[PDB]
Amino acid sequence: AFCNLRRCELSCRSLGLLGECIGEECKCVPY
């Protein structure tokens, strides 16, 4: 499976941030 970027985003949105995928995993970004 791919990284769930379309849900990673909604998760970082709860912190007021953007979401981003690196390799197979999720992080948040200041963008």
From Swiss-Prot:
> Per the record, what is the consequence of mutating residue 7 to A?
In r-R6A-R7A; 1.74-fold decrease in cytotoxicity towards Jurkat cells. In GS-R7A; 2-fold decrease in cytotoxicity towards Jurkat cells
Superkingdom in the source lineage: Eukaryota
- Name the InterPro entries for this protein: Scorpion_toxin-like_sf (IPR036574), Scorpion_toxinS_K_inh (IPR001947)
Question: Where expressed (tissues)?
Answer: Expressed by the venom gland.
Show the GO cellular component annotation of the record: extracellular region
Key word Secreted present in the record?
Answer: yes
- Start and end residues of each stretch annotated as [R/K]XCQ motif: 6-9
The UniProt function text for this chain reads: Blocks small conductance calcium-activated potassium channels. Shows activity on KCa2.2/KCNN2 (IC(50)=0.0243 nM), KCa2.3/KCNN3 (IC(50)=1.7 nM), and KCa2.1/KCNN1 (IC(50)=42 nM). Induces cell death when tested on human T lymphoblastic leukemia Jurkat E6.1 and human breast cancer MDA-MB-231 cell lines which constituvely express KCa2.2/KCNN2, but not on human peripheral blood lymphocytes (which do not express KCa2.2/KCNN2).
Family statement drawn from the similarity comment of this UniProt entry: Belongs to the short scorpion toxin superfamily. Potassium channel inhibitor family. Alpha-KTx 05 subfamily.
Protein name (record): Potassium channel toxin alpha-KTx 5.4
| Species of the source | Hottentotta tamulus
